[PDB]
Amino acid sequence: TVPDRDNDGIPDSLEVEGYTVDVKNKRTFLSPWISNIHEKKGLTKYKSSPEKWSTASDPYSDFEKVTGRIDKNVSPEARHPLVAAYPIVHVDMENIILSKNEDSQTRTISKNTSTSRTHTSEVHGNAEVHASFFDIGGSVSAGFSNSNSSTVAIDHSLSLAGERTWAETMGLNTADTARLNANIRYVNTGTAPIYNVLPTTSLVLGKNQTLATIKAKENQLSQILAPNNYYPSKNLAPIALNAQSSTPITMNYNQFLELEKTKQLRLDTDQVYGNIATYNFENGRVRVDTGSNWSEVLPQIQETTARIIFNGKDLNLVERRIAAVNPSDPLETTKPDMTLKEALKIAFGFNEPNGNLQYQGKDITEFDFNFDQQTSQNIKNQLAELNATNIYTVLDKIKLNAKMNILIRDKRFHYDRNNIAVGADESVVKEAHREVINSSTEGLLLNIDKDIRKILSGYIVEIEDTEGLKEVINDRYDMLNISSLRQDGKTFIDFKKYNDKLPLYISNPNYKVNVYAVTKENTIINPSENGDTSTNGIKKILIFSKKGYEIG
Amino acid sequence: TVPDRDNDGIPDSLEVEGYTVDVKNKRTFLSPWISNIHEKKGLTKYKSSPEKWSTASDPYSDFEKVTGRIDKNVSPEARHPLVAAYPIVHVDMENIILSKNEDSQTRTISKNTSTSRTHTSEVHGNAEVHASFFDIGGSVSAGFSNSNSSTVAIDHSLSLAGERTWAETMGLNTADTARLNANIRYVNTGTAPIYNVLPTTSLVLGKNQTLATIKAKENQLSQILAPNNYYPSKNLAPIALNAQSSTPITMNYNQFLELEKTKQLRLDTDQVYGNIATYNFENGRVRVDTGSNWSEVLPQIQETTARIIFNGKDLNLVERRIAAVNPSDPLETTKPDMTLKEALKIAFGFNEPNGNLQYQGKDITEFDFNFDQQTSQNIKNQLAELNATNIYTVLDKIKLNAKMNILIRDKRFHYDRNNIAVGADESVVKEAHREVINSSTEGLLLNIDKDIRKILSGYIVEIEDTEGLKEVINDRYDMLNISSLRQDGKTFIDFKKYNDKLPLYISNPNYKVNVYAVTKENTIINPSENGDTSTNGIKKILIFSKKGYEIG
Ligand SMILES: [Ca+2]
Ligand SMILES: [Ca+2]
Ligand SMILES: [Ca+2]
Ligand SMILES: [Ca+2]
C-alpha cells in the first residue's frame, strides 16, 4: 500500500527525496539515499519525479531505467531518470559520383565527402528578413530549433592529372544533363534506437534547390539503428542513392555549375522514426509496440526539457536533453529542480576530479556558453539575483527551465555558421605538430592531435633557398591532398604524391623544407576571378622547417 | 507462496544458490544443489538469475530449458540457463556456373566451390582509414561485430583439357555479358531454429560490387532450419540462384575478368529470421507465436552476453554467447558471475579429464586467445590485479562481462584475414601423411588427418632421377586437383588423372616418386605476369618419396 501516484514502482518519497539501486545477494534493491554506505560503493543519487511515468517523457518508466529492466540498447547516460532517451538520426554521405547523363569511363568524376551534423544559428545582424520575423512564433526560430540537418562537402582536391573544371573533365555543355549518385549511411546520434522505418531525408543544393528526397522502403529493413552506430554497420556495404529506381537524379548545366562553385550539398532529415521497443514485466521481453511511435511521444521531450549541444567526445555537435522543469506547468513542477552543473554531469559526463568541473581533462572554462534569445534572459535574470559576472562560478546555481537551449562548444577552435570544427589559432595548430617521428625525402610521419587534424584542409610543401626563395612543390589549390593516416594513429605526409612520384630533390642540403598547414576556414576550393590555380593568396601556417642535412 | 520474482518457476534461492533437476519415479523434480548425491549421478549445477525470465534473454525461460519443456530443436548446450539460444545462419555455395549471356554447350564453365563462415578482423596497421575511425561508435567496429558473412572460393583447378583463360573458353569479348548461376544452401550454425522466413543474403564481388541479392519468398517454405543442419536437407536438391525469375545475374567483361582474377565471391546475410517457436504449458504444444520474432528479442542477447568464437568441432568458426554480466546494469547483475573457464565448459564442451581443461583431447593451451580493443583491457586489468603473465593459469579466474568478445582458434594451423583454416607448418603437415595404406603406379591411398587435409590445396606429382632431376608430372598450377576421398575416410591420390589416364612410367625402378603437398596459403590460382602455368614458383612440402622398387 506504499504511496505511489506515478505507479512506476518507485514510492513517492524515494523518488522525491532521492534513491538508487544496488544488488545484495544477487537481487536488485531499490532503496533511499544514504550519503554514507551508498556514496561509497560508487552508486548515484537518482532523484526523479513522482507524478510522471517517465520524468523525461520518453517511453521509459523512471523505474524501468534505474532498475535496468528496459531495452538494453538505450544509451547508458539515458538510463538516468532525468536524461532524455529519444533517437536522433542524421545522414552521412561518404562519397558521391557525378557523371554525364547517358565508351564513357573517364568522363566521370568521383570525389570523397565529409559529412557532419550541424546546428545553424542566426546571422550577424543585417540579413533582410521578412516583416514576419518579429512576430509570435512567426520566423522566430530562436536561432536554432528541433530538426536534423547534416552537411557534406566535396573533396576539392584532385582525382586525375592536370584536370581542370569538372566541365571539360566530363564534357558537359549547356544542353546537357548530369546524373548524381552517392553512397550514404544513416547514423543515430541520440540516446534511443529505431527498430524499423528509417527517416525521410531530402538532399538539397543551395538554399532551396532540392536534388532528390531519399526515403528507403519501410519495414523493408529489420536492422537496428542503435545509438552511436552507423546504420549500414561500418562493417558492411554503405547504402547507395538512386542505384538499386526508375528516376535518377537530374542536374542541368547551371546546377552542375553551382555544385562546383561550392562543392557542398545539404542533407535534411525528418523525425518520423519507426515504432518503439518497450519492456514487458510478465516474461521480461523486449517488444516493439505498434501502439507507441516516437511521433507521438517525442514532442513532449522537446516541450519539457533542456537541450544542450556539447562537443567533447569529438568536434561533432552532440545533442542531449535533461529533465528540466517548467513553472507554468503544475505537473512539470513535480520534476526535480535542475542545475546547469548537475546537468553537464549526467548529460555528457563532466566530473569533479579535484573540485573542478572538467570533462575528461578539459576544464568547463575551456568551452563557450551560447544561449538563445530566450534562455539568454532566463539565465541573465539569475546571474542578476546572484550578483556575479562569471557564470562558471555560479554555475552550480543556474536553474534550467524546460524549452531552454544551450550550446557548449570547445573554445579552442573557431566556428562557422553551422557550428562546425572549422579551424583554431596558429598557436594550438603549431603545438599539435611539435611532435615528429620520422623525417624523410619521401614524407613526414607525425603523431598530430586528432582534435586538431580535423580542422586542417591540407599542407603546402615548399623549399626556401638559403637566401630567401619561396619555391613551392604542390602549388595548386587542388594539390593540398597529401596528409594520410596510418591506422596506428600517426598522420603520414607525403611530398611524392605531388612530384612525379619521386622523392625530394635536394641540390643543396642546406635549404629549408617548409611544409605549411591550411585550416579549413582558410583553404580555397576554386581558382580566382582569373585562373590563379596557385597557392599565392592563402593563409597557411608554418608546421615544419628542417634543413637538408637534418633529414636524410 | 515460494519467493520467485522472475516468475519463471524456479524459486529465487534455487536459481541463485544453485539447482538442477532429476527424475524420481518418472516425474521431474527441481531441487537445490547437493555436491553429494547430485554431483555423482552426473547432473549439473544450474545457477541462473532470479530477475530474468531467461537470463540469456532469448525466448526461453530458464525453467523452460532445464526442465526440458521447450522446443525440442533447441541445441543441447543451449538447454542451459546461461547459454544463448539464438539462431545463426550463413549461406553455403556448393558450385557455380558461368556462361555467356544468351549451339552453346561447351561455351560454359562449371567449377565447384568451398564456402565457410568468416569473421574478418582488422588489418595490420597502415590501411588508410577515414578520420571517422577514432570516434565514438563511428567506424569502431572493434575488429569484428554482429553480422553473418560467409565466403566462397571457386575451384581453380581444371574442368576440360588444355583450357586457358575462361575468356577463350567461353568466348567473351569486351562488348559481352556473362550470366552467373549457382546452387546454394542456407545452413544454421547457432543454437536455435528458424521456422519460416529465411534470411535476405546478398552476393557480393570484391569490396562493394553486388552481383545480386537472394531472398527466396517468405512463408513460401514451412521446412525448419534447425541447428547444425543445412536448410535444403543434405539429402535433397540444393537451392539454385536465379534459375527457378525474370532478371538473372548480369556481369560485364571487366567484372567477369575480376572474378577470374580472384576466383572468389562473398556472401553477406542479414538477421531477419522468421517468428519464434515457443512452449505452451496448457497442452504442452510447440507453437510459432506471430507476436515474437527474433528481430525483437535478439539484440538483447548481443547486448548482455559474452561472445566466443571457437573452432574445435572442426575448423569452421563456431559462435556462442554466454550469460555474462554487466556492472552498469542493476538487473544484469542479478546474473550468475561468469568465468572464462566455466564458459568454455558449457559454451562448447571443454572438460577436465585429469585436471586439465582440454577439449575432446586437445589442451586449452593449444588454442590462441584473441580479444577485441575492449575485451583486451577488461581482461588485462584482471591479469594485473591477479599478478600473472599466463592467462591459461588464472583462466578459472577471468570475469566475463557482457559485450565481451573472444576468439579461441586452434594454434596449430595458420590463419588469414577472415580467420579461416589456411595452412599449418610443414611439421604438422608431414605428420598427417606419415601413414600409408597402398602404394601403386596408379595412386597412393592414405588415411590423412581431416583437420589437416582441409588446409591443403593439392599435390604435385614428380620424379627425381638417381642423379638429381626434378621432372614433374602435373606441372601446371591447375593440375593440383588430384586428391580424392573415399567414404571410408581415406584420401585417395591419383597420378593418372594427369598422365594420359595411364599409370606411372618407371623406366628405372630406382628413382624417387616425389609427391608434394601445397597448403592453401601457398597455392596459386593464376599464371604469372607472363604465362608461367608451371609449378616453378611454389612452396610445396615433401609428403612422399619412395623408390621405384618400393611400390610396384
Ligand atoms: Ca514513482
Ligand atoms: Ca515517476
Ligand atoms: Ca526463477
Ligand atoms: Ca529467472
Q: Residue A325: how many CA atoms within 13 Å on its side-chain side?
A: 18
Question: What is the sign, positive or negative, of the torsion defined by CA atoms of A391, A393, A394, A398?
Answer: positive
Q: What are the counts of helices (DSSP H) followed by strands (DSSP E) for chain B?
A: 10, 30
Is residue A230 a contact partner of residue B138, using CB atoms and an 8 Å limit? yes
B331 CB near a chain A CB, below 8 Å?
yes
A438 CB near a chain B CB, below 8 Å?
no
Q: What is the DSSP letter of A500?
A: T
Contacts of A287 in chain B (CB under 8 A): 291-292, 296-297
Q: Residue A3: how many CA atoms within 13 Å on its side-chain side?
A: 7
d(CA B304, CA B298): 10
B336 CB near a chain A CB, below 8 Å?
yes
In single-letter form, the type of residue at position A456 comes to L
Return the closest-CA partner of residue B12 out of B331, B334, B338, B333.
Answer: B334
Cell numbers that stand for A253 in this block: 548545366
Q: What are the counts of helices (DSSP H) followed by strands (DSSP E) for chain A?
A: 10, 30
DSSP annotation string for A298-332 = SHHHHHSSEEEEE--SSSS-EEEEE--B-SS-SGG
B396 CB near a chain A CB, below 8 Å?
no
B544 CB near a chain A CB, below 8 Å?
no
Closest residue in A to B6 (Cα) is A283
Question: What is the sign, positive or negative, of the torsion defined by CA atoms of B52, B54, B59, B60?
Answer: negative
Chosen CATH of A303-421 out of 3.40.50.300, 3.30.70.3270, 3.40.50.2000, 3.10.20.110: 3.10.20.110
Contacts of B50 in chain A (CB under 8 A): 26-27
Assign 3-class secondary structure to B119-185.
Answer: CCCCCCCCCCCCHHHCCCCCCCCCCCCCCEEEEEEECCCCCCCCCCCHHHHHCCCCCCEEECCEEEE
d(CA B76, CA B224): 17
In single-letter form, the type of residue at position B391 comes to I
Where exactly are the structural domains of chain B? 1-85, 86-302, 303-421, 422-552
Is residue B277 a contact partner of residue B71, using CB atoms and an 8 Å limit? yes
**Ligand number with the minimum distance to the CA of B53:** 4
d(CA B452, CA B232): 28
Identify from A63, A235, A276, A456 which residue to disrupt to test chain B contact, counting B C-beta atoms within 10 A and taking the largest count.
A235
Contacts of A229 in chain B (CB under 8 A): 137
**Ligand number with the minimum distance to the CA of A48:** 2
DSSP annotation string for A161-202 = SS--SHHHHHT--TT-BEE--EEEEEEE-SSS-B-SPPP-EE
- Which residues of A make up each annotated binding site for Ca(2+)? 4, 6, 8, 10, 15, 49, 52, 62
B126 CB near a chain A CB, below 8 Å?
yes
Identify from A487, A493, A497 which residue to disrupt to test chain B contact, counting B C-beta atoms within 10 A and taking the largest count.
A487
CB-count burial class (<10 Å; 0-12, 13-18, 19+) for A264: middle
Interface of A with B in 351-380 (CB under 8 A): none
Name beta bridge partners: B186.
B91
Considering only CB atoms, B299 lies closest to which of A22, A76, A224, namely A224
- With b for 16 or more beta-carbon neighbours within 10 A and e for fewer, the A87-104 pattern comes to bbbbbbbbbbbbbbeeee
Terminal alpha carbon distance of chain A: 83
Cell numbers that stand for B188 in this block: 544454421
Count of CB atoms situated within 10 Å of the CB of A27: 17
Interface of A with B in 202-241 (CB under 8 A): 222-224, 226-230, 233-238
- State which H helix or E strand residue B25 sits in: none
Mode of pairing for the β-strands spanning B515-519 and B456-463: antiparallel
Mode of pairing for the β-strands spanning B178-179 and B98-100: antiparallel
- Reported in sequence order, the residue ranges of A326-447 that DSSP labels E, i.e. its strands, are 358-359, 362-363, 367-371, 404-410, 445-446
Inspect the interface and report whether the beta carbons of B5 and A22 lie closer than 8 Å: no
Contacts of B140 in chain A (CB under 8 A): 234
Residues with CB under 5 A from ligand 3 (ion): B 6, 8, 10, 15
Mode of pairing for the β-strands spanning B98-100 and B89-96: unpaired
Identify how the structure was determined. Answer: X-ray
Measure B1 CA to ligand 3 centroid, in angstroms: 13
d(CA B57, CA B321): 11
Indicate the SS3 state at residue A374. Answer: helix
Interface of A with B in 463-502 (CB under 8 A): 484-489
Indicate the SS3 state at residue B506. Answer: coil
Rounded alpha-carbon distances, angstroms, from residue A430 to A192, A436, A521, A524: 40, 12, 16, 20
Cell numbers that stand for B266 in this block: 562473398
Inspect the interface and report whether the beta carbons of B130 and A94 lie closer than 8 Å: yes
Contacts of A187 in chain B (CB under 8 A): 138
Q: What is the DSSP letter of A47?
A: -
Is residue B477 a contact partner of residue B458, using CB atoms and an 8 Å limit? no
Look-up of cell digits 603406379: B441
Indicate the SS3 state at residue B241. Answer: coil
d(CA B347, CA B239): 32
d(CA A7, CA A11): 8
d(CA B228, CA B451): 18
Residues 6 or more apart whose CB falls under 8 angstroms from that of A530 comprise none
Measure B289 CA to ligand 4 centroid, in angstroms: 21
Q: What is the DSSP letter of B336?
A: P
Return the closest-CA partner of residue A21 out of A52, A62, A82.
Answer: A62
Residues 6 or more apart whose CB falls under 8 angstroms from that of A157 comprise A111, A458, A478, A479, A480, A481
Rounded alpha-carbon distances, angstroms, from residue B94 to B155, B207, B240: 10, 22, 10
Return the closest-CA partner of residue B331 out of B12, B51, B58, B14.
Answer: B51
CB-count burial class (<10 Å; 0-12, 13-18, 19+) for B514: buried
d(CA B17, CA B525): 59
Rounded alpha-carbon distances, angstroms, from residue A530 to A156, A173, A473, A526, B25: 18, 21, 21, 10, 99
d(CA A486, CA A446): 10
Assign 3-class secondary structure to A255-266.
Answer: HHHHHHHHCEEE
d(CA A552, CA A503): 11
Return the closest-CA partner of residue A456 out of A228, A159, A157.
Answer: A157
Is residue B324 a contact partner of residue B55, using CB atoms and an 8 Å limit? no
Phi/psi at B152 (5° precision): -110, 160
Chain-centroid distance of CA B327 in Å reads 32
Closest residue in A to B15 (Cα) is A26
Closest residue in B to A186 (Cα) is B138
Is residue A170 a contact partner of residue A176, using CB atoms and an 8 Å limit? no
Contacts of A223 in chain B (CB under 8 A): 270-271
d(CA A49, CA A318): 26
d(CA B501, CA A83): 77
- With b for 16 or more beta-carbon neighbours within 10 A and e for fewer, the B270-289 pattern comes to bbbbbbbbbbeeeeeeeeee
Return the closest-CA partner of residue A165 out of A473, A508, A498, A527.
Answer: A527
Question: What is the sign, positive or negative, of the torsion defined by CA atoms of A383, A388, A391, A396?
Answer: negative
B538 CB near a chain A CB, below 8 Å?
no
Assign 3-class secondary structure to B94-120.
Answer: EEECEEECCCCCCCEECCEECCEECCC
Angle at B547 between CA B545 and CA B548, to 5 degrees: 130
- State which H helix or E strand residue A69 sits in: none
Look-up of cell digits 630567401: A468
Is residue A65 a contact partner of residue A84, using CB atoms and an 8 Å limit? no
Helix residue spans in A6-147 (DSSP H): 12-17, 37-41, 62-67
d(CA A27, CA A46): 19
Indicate the SS3 state at residue B520. Answer: coil
d(CA B374, CA B403): 9
For the A86-302 domain, the top CATH level (class) is: mainly beta
Is residue A454 a contact partner of residue A514, using CB atoms and an 8 Å limit? no
Chain-centroid distance of CA B500 in Å reads 38
- State which H helix or E strand residue A5 sits in: none
d(CA B62, CA B349): 20
Residues 6 or more apart whose CB falls under 8 angstroms from that of B471 comprise B462, B463, B464, B465
Interface of A with B in 67-96 (CB under 8 A): 67-69, 71-73, 76, 79, 92, 94
- State which H helix or E strand residue B426 sits in: helix B426-433
CATH 2.60.40.810 fits A422-552, yes or no: yes
Inspect the interface and report whether the beta carbons of B7 and A72 lie closer than 8 Å: no
Closest residue in B to A183 (Cα) is B208
d(CA B178, CA B124): 36
Considering only CB atoms, A237 lies closest to which of B123, B131, B208, namely B208
Measure B112 CA to ligand 2 centroid, in angstroms: 63
d(CA B58, CA B44): 21
Q: Residue B448: how many CA atoms within 13 Å on its side-chain side?
A: 26
Return the closest-CA partner of residue B506 out of B458, B473, B482, B534.
Answer: B473
DSSP annotation string for A413-466 = S-B-SS--B----HHHHHHHH---SB--SS--EE---HHHHTTEEEEEEEEB-S
Cell numbers that stand for B146 in this block: 554482429
Assign 3-class secondary structure to B268-306.
Answer: EECCCCCEEEECCHHHCCCEEEEEEECCCCCHHHHHCCE
Return the closest-CA partner of residue A84 out of A300, A245, A315, A265.
Answer: A300
B333 CB near a chain A CB, below 8 Å?
yes
Question: What does the radius of gyration of chain B's CA atoms come to, in whole angstroms?
Answer: 27
Question: What does the radius of gyration of chain A's CA atoms come to, in whole angstroms?
Answer: 27
Look-up of cell digits 539464438: B86
d(CA B258, CA B263): 8
Is residue B333 a contact partner of residue A28, using CB atoms and an 8 Å limit? yes
B61 CB near a chain A CB, below 8 Å?
yes
Rounded alpha-carbon distances, angstroms, from residue A485 to A473, A545, B434: 21, 21, 49
- State which H helix or E strand residue A466 sits in: none
